[model samples]
Target: TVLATSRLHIEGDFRGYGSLDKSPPGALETLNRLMQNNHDEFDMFWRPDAGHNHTAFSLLSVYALGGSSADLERAYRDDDPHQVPIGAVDHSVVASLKDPRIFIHRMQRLDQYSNYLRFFEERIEARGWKAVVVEYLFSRSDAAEAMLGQLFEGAYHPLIQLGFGIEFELPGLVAEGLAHCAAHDAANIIPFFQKAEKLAKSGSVAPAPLVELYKEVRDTEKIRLAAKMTQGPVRVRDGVMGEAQDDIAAVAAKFQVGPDGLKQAIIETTSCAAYSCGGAQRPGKVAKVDFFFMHMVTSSIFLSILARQDWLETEDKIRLVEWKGRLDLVWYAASSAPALDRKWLEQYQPTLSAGMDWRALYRAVTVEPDDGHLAKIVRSLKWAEEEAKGVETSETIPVAGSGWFKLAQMAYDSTAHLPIPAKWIMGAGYDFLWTRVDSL
Candidate 1:
């Protein structure tokens, strides 16, 4: 009997969810069900409304944090309004997916979700996750190169989706990520990154710290003027990549990182994201944790993990950091160079967590009904603080010591008393964004 019996045991820090605490009851079960449910029934996006389906990403994040089953269910219920049913897939789209030459630049059609998902699922199954990922995403071959650029487009959702997949080691999520990337048309911003790469390698523009380069962007008139005081989903394409294209590229190019500098680059990149987002707060208005800039941090949270993968190429790792750093700089300028005063953090008072430590604050967010953004931010700041050993005191880093705790507090409090704390101020810089009746 012993020879045929099974075994059971307990463990610690499994998969980096940050606790010896066993998963909350039904939390693991619900995560699996939701992932399967969303994949089977929903579109990657909801039409006409210009919204994304984040149920899978958020649900997994919640599970990782030992969130209760109730928390997971709440997120799914909240997300239902924006969840459109998947439609029929055209065979034509599936058949032509391999030739990036013909389809890399095409816009994703409404009916193509099922087909694209199927296409990626099959490719990933046939070749395994890492192989398909490199061949279609990180590889520098013509097809893979163009495909990689697509990941940067579409508000970086594709990149984020893929990140969750790789982080969690779920090949199914990887399939969804690849499909998501392939369906986007971010070629508009691709050329700028390419130009940044060219300029970075040209040796004419000396590399500078991300914080320093951000100052140059803020100091520059044209790039600062690139963003108007307005509210739009994709704000950067408005001016940052438009009239100020060359200027943005020049600034972005100077943020070069070497193979040895990935961690520093991650710190610098995330530091700017947290700074630009929280720093955009207006003196007389509600706090601003910026919907657009939030992506920079959420996206950066996964970079170090992906960068650490031995299967991924060294060249590709450097490329990932450099491109992300460049985009962070461009996006900072895109937000009209919001008031990045160090005093803002000094002056910030946490209404909810005035005296709490990071552990208490992190616990508060873990159980909240959210779409995963705030939790991810809190986790990222925690990582920043833990990893800030050598780099936390740098000029670009807005705060040191317990500063990361304040940011976690700010991210949680910024959306204070909303139906969902996951939703924060839409545009941090625009006066019109904060003037809306909802913010109060």
Candidate 2:
């Protein structure tokens, strides 16, 4: 029998058995034996050290089966579900879960991580969770505190929480979910808030702070709508490259905070990426830093260009200088390159431009022999090779090698000039770049 049905099917002889109740035919006993028999497969999914996507589904399943607090803590321990490999689980099984929201909500309440709550927040409107939100808000439940905390912290928007320290941002998903509910029932919510306010006045219910928070949801949506309006349509290309650009463009347009909001968002996102790459999963991989540096520089240059074109204010230039200084210090500490040419970097003033020269932007941050298109290509390739060599590893050689090559490819593509054939990129394809080194 299938796992969910075999264990959780409560229709026949198993009629009165809840997961927490192990009485009659023994639901817990059956599950325990089945799980013990297939321990290896279960372990692959249940162990906290397993990939997060695998562990999350297992954790949820355990919860659905009436697993206790000890069971949850033992299974998940300190794992953060944010790093999970997305969409790796069976969607139908995940969708068919009875009150999966409660499982996720409990996990988050037990241990707070914006990532886990997002899994709940994402499904809120679809699951018709307005009443749940209302219930939590008006009652003295941990769920209310958790949900409200996210709303207040995210300023009722998820875009603000994408980068930097946890202190700087909060989970935006709950706010987003609330916004969806507000959109569908804007007229009815004020009465909901007024009723809650009356209950609060009588001291019959806890003060529902989210009533005010929800009241502002429509105002917040105006900014989100304006940000979305900024993007006109563009041609879609091919492959991961195309997908990446589209993703970035969509995200960039979503920065609706303020005039300098977009620039700050980019910085925070980059900082978060640097932290994630440098964390436990892949330590000492300065090559990841180098890869992100390209993105940082490209974004900085583009933002400068936008400033010059009068698209945004120049106040961000001060912050950009600080960001560049921070990055240059980290790069100097990590890379084999002796010194960065700060001629363009130091004098990077915000000015107006009638049009952007993509080639000029490329040369500004690169090494010498950066005169023309192909020269720029040669220099970028050499820099990437040096950066890739900084990674101290055996199996990661191919992975890091592929990354640098792709970085080089992006540099070439950014110019929008002649295409560097795959064979000619390093005088061979990507595989030729990997090497085995004996002495460190």
Candidate 3:
């Protein structure tokens, strides 16, 4: 009860200052202040309950009735959170931080943010209004960390504190989630600069905020650092809102539709406007939804497509079948999408490829975790059992590398669905992991 009402409902604000025309020289100062604030916020949340292990509550919550920890563990073992509801909020967004999922704000797109920001600023500048950039600062990883941090501190809630810790964790989670998303939709993460420049030249709705520039600090020729220098602290109190509000007022005063038009335009382009990970509440429905890129589209669409297919190989066919099955369960709970059914899975089985091992196929495609719980999630899920006929466990040697893939393969085969396609089955070995999955 407390977790749902308190931490889950909390909010925060951060300010960004920059101009396309001017170099963000003040970025360093902003970043420093932001980092400091973040650190302080972290201290406040995990301060220890006077004498507990700090992680006690979180662990308990992990086992809590509604806890998705078990499912998360299953996903880790099978390398398929896409199928399970471990920490996912819906088909579009994720609530996990350990492995991190990535989603893109359409406004964050090169052309989208840049163009919109420019058009948005024009009206403001006309009436002596300034553009204030407020970075909401909540991404998938941030959400994951906030929830996880509380759990770690024996505190089972979200957003209990709104300072630097939450802010810092958000970006880190987003970046990592983006990394995961890059796996399926390699084109989703546009260079922030490229996005800004595109938006500016197009004279789009919201003009890009010219924040600070990245420094060559730790890097010489190719060596690089955190790139924390080019940005500023995540401050919101007297920051972006004053400017945004004034700009909106100025623009509205002149245009017949006024700032409302800009607001509407923002709604059309990105997830940022209405259903943001940080903003949208439960029981809310997003109107006029569209993908920021083909990657995001593929992330969800592919799974759906995979579910609606048929396969032949008994063991191999289960790969996609299981994924769709698990996804069905989650979809039913979140938005009433059809859940996986053994009867349905069986009909699709006969069409699967004869010798292809989708378990191996998917493993080849999903990204391995860098250092977080995502990397270990697959191990936590149940292991693949030796199908009675040895048919399911035929490729024992290959499945051992990452048990998660094997578990995924097992889930798919065990389920009743059509066989997964060969094209979808063999794309894993590539260097990227699907990052967009985390962002939704």
Candidate 4:
């Protein structure tokens, strides 16, 4: 009986229905008339001025994403994987980039003033960049590389806005340099090459043809190098770019990247800091009468890097070497580091010894003040404050005579009192006087 009878729990009627879910939405009926209230939100940051407006609207998205100056900056220099800052959206990032630009510009201005004053007469006779010029420039360049260096060198005002036409990051120093130049009638200091010009104009066969030959040959050589950066291994001794193409073929086999790409990266990475010629991201006309001279120096470095690369194309390997041979006459008139071959600037050398004779002062003070220690200390302090203009010492006198070692000790003994002191003096304590000379 239990098997034959139907289940008692069946509760609903089995009505006829279509296969599409019984009855769908019954003719698409507009069910209950439901309504909801709503309001709109509107706001914005805007400006009419071209500079401000352009920067603002472009940066709106930047702010929306919590953009900051620091964030914007990271996007420019590094290659970390992150959302790019809104501020960097424009090619105009360089224009709005303030402090870094000032730092670079001030340095460039300094380079300009310094280059004009180097002893061209002695340098010209060397047949290439004189060792003294390279040594002096490289040494001074190392000194001015920092903020304190800027202050010590008197380049502070160049860090400010629209301060002076000839301002360096070391403004005070720039003023002093101008004053010195004025005193020495440096208006005509930027050599005009009058002798060479006269020889060219004289039209006589003597020096005139020689001058003309020099000019034409110089120009022709530069063109030759530009063409060569695209070609072979060029040895860069004495500023001429020579063909050494075969040397690079092995290097190319080792590294998969092309010569051009590696060359580009190297060129972009290079940054220069010179004694008189500061530094800049790119070359500008205002900085020099013959801007190509600086370009030649920069170009020479490019050539060398190419020659050294082990991963680039074989032909590209020689681009730099070729440039060196090509530029021999172009930058031959400059100075060079003694340790290096003719005109090359080996920037990492340790030959330059600026500042006063710290060794002598150390010996004098250790010996006893009556042994001319105090006198030497006083003289060194005077030299640092009064004579050297806080930038550089006159020359490397004997350590016994330089006098700065003791004065530095006195300064430190006095400064040990302050919990927070002027940053530069603090640096000086750790570096200049108290520092172990051999360590440098």
What TM-score would candidate 2 get against the native? 0.21
Candidate 1 error regions (>4 Å): 1-22, 48-50, 103-111, 420-423, 436-440
lDDT of 1 at 181: 78
Per-candidate count of clashing residue pairs (backbone under 3 Å): 0, 3, 76, 43
lDDT tens readout by residue for model 2, 1-440:
12221121112322110122222334344434433232212211121211112232223233333344444343343233322322233344334323535532333221223223233344443443333444433243554433333331111111111110011111222332332222111111122222332443453432212112212221332311221111111111121112232222222222222345444433333322222122211111112123223333322222222223232234433333322322222221122112122121222222321132432322332221111222222233333334335452232121233333333333433333222222111101012222210121
User: Which scores higher on TM-score, 2 or 4?
Assistant: 2
What is the C-alpha lDDT profile of model 4 across 1-440, one tens digit per residue?
Answer: 12111111111222111011111222111100100000001101111110101121111111112223332232212212111221211223222322334323434222222222222212322322223222322232432222211221111111111111111111222222221121121111011122222332455423211122223432443422422221111112212212211221111112122345433322211111121111111111111111222222222222332234343344534322322222222232221110111112212111212232443333222222121112212222332232222333222111111223222443333222222212112111011222312122
Best by lDDT: 1
Between candidates 1 and 4, name the one with more favorable lDDT.
1
Residue 44 Cα positional deviation in candidate 2, in Å, after optimal superposition: 21
RMSD of 4: 30.7
For all predicted structures, in order, the TM-scores are: 0.90, 0.21, 0.17, 0.16
Q: Give candidate 2 regions above 4 Å deviation.
A: 1-293, 301-324, 340-410, 413-440
Candidate closer to the true structure by TM-score (higher is better), 3 or 4: 3
Q: Can you list the residue pairs that collide in candidate 1?
A: none
lDDT of 3 by residue, 1-440 (tens): 11111111112223211001111233333333332232222221111121111121121112211123332232233322112111111312222211222322332222221122222223223322111111112122442222221211111111111111222223222221222222111111112112322333354434321010001111111212111111122111122221222322222121111222322221111111111111111112111111111111112212222222232122222222222221111111111111111222122222122244533322322222211111112222211211111312121111212232333333333221322221121111111212211221
lDDT of 1 by residue, 208-239 (tens): 87887888888998888777765354557667
